[PDB]
Amino acid sequence: EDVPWFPRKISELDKCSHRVLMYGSELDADHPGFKDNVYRQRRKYFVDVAMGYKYGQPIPRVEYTEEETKTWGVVFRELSKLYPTHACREYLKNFPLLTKYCGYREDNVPQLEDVSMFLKERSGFTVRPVAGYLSPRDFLAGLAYRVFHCTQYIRHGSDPLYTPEPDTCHELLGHVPLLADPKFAQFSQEIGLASLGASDEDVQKLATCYFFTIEFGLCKQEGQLRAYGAGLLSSIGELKHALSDKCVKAFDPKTTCLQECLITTFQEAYFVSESFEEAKEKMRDFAKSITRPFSVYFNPYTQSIEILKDTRSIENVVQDLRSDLNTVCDALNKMNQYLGI
């Protein structure tokens, strides 16, 4: 096959995790911490911890500094005020659970290891510390395994409200709460699976889709508009605007991928899904249209990718689907058996 390589077992994903195109140690010219050498040590320290991680090892716990904690607290405190009225219902349900089990409070910074075990029990997702920016191919590859790569560093203390870069605050307050949702999780994994062995152009179609959904997504819950995009949750200024008076469009994959992603500017438009079950099924049809010589089936038992290119593997799937339907019948039998319905 002439197709692009993609990890076919969970252990192979480490290759993706470590292909860092730009390390966190590398600060851009206009960055606030660019002349702060105390800050740089921390960035280098976090990069090193991430580089040391390999599959099968517990996610390392790190002790945050006091100013970092205050920085986290400031972000945590300000965003909390806007969540009751700007966050989606899925976000609201999960967030208190995080306070109880992951130490999600103003004076404490959660550990990825805590969050990972929390996520694995509730939605099957896990987190990995990432040393820096990855190729969209390698990043989305992680999603196929329900693995989210997280930055472990804190934004510069100079201005807590603003960040030009993803940080642990963005990871913890923006992404994690909604990753816990089983339906949101399936939706995320669909984007990942779609990328596997796809062309670069298709990958970046998916990357754009991810950007306007996971990063900046709005969903209508109970007849009202709420935000579920992680970027929106992290940014107070943008979050206000997203749900404010004045441009929203329905989430359609084919239409959405065309748009351009802006880092500095408030986004041109914000897309909407009635539900994550809708987004997952609008993704799984889009995934069919993606060009590749095979389809992919995810085996959660062996944590590997099955390639569906012959009738043998396909029937095997169908046979499985038959047995599972038999279990559905059992449940319906028992339900009639015990409730007379």
Q: What angle do CA 215, 218, 223 make, to 5 degrees?
A: 160
Q: Which is nearer to Fe ion, 230 or 272 (CB)?
A: 230
Distances 32 to 78, 100, 163 between C-alpha atoms, Å: 20, 33, 9
39, 47 Cβ separation under 8 angstroms: no
- CA 181 to CA 177: how far, in whole Å? 8
Alpha carbon distance 90, 73 (integer Å): 23
Determine what percent of the chain falls in helix, strand and coil, rounding each to the nearest 5: 55, 15, 35
Strands 217-221 and 224-227, bridge-based pairing: antiparallel
Instruction: Pick what 133 binds: its own copies, Fe ion, ligand JCR, none; C-beta below 5 to 8 Å, kind-dependent.
Output: ligand JCR
From the list ligand JCR, Fe ion, its own copies, none, pick the one residue 165 interacts with, judged by a Cβ distance below 5 to 8 Å according to partner type.
ligand JCR
Return the number of the residue (170 or 282) whose C-beta is nearest ligand JCR: 170
Per rule CB under 8 A, is residue 244 in the interface with its own copies?
Answer: no
Question: Which one among 231, 253, 270, 276 touches ligand JCR, defined by CB under 6 A?
Answer: 231
Question: 308: closest CA among 200, 199, 196, 205?
Answer: 196
d(CA 169, CA 167): 5
18 is an annotated ligand-binding site residue? no
Judged by CB under 6 A, the residue of 33, 129, 166, 197 near ligand JCR is: 166
Nearest approach in angstroms of CB 223 to its own copies is 12
215 is catalytic: yes
Q: Is 175 annotated as a binding residue?
A: yes
Could you say whether residue 258 binds its own copies (CB under 8 A)? Answer: no
Q: Label residue 124 left, alpha or beta by phi (over 0 means left) and psi (-120 to 50 means alpha).
A: left
Q: Is 62 in the site for Fe ion (CB under 5 A)?
A: no
Position among 28, 78, 121, 201 found at the interface with its own copies (CB under 8 A): 121
Residues making up the chain, counted from first to last: 341
# residues contacting its own copies (CB under 8 A): 61
Q: How many CB atoms lie within 10 A of CB 133?
A: 18
- Whichever of 143 and 180 has its CB closer to ligand JCR, that residue is 143
CB 173 within 8 A of CB 79: yes
- Which residues pair with residue 219 across a beta bridge? 226, 273
Whether 241 sits among the annotated catalytic residues: the reply is no
Nearer to Fe ion, 47 or 143 (CB): 143
Catalytic residue status for 86: no
Of residues 245 through 274, those in contact with ligand JCR by CB under 6 A are none
Residue 136 binds which entry of its own copies, Fe ion, ligand JCR, none, CB below 5-8 Å type-dependent: ligand JCR
The residue nearest ligand JCR at its CB is: 136
- Which residue matches tokens 């089936």? 297
Distance CA 284, CA 307 (A): 16
Which residues, in sequence order, are bridge partners of residue 154? none
The one among 14, 124, 157, 221 contacting its own copies by CB under 8 A:
124
> Footprint of its own copies on this chain (CB under 8 A)?
9, 11, 120-124, 146, 185-186, 250, 252, 277, 280-281, 284-285, 287-288, 292-297, 299-304, 308-315, 317-319, 321-336, 338-339, 341
Annotated binding site for Fe cation: 170, 175, 215
Catalytic residues, by residue number, are 170, 175, 215, 234
> Footprint of ligand JCR on this chain (CB under 6 A)?
130, 132-134, 136, 139, 149, 151, 165-166, 170, 207, 210-211, 215, 231
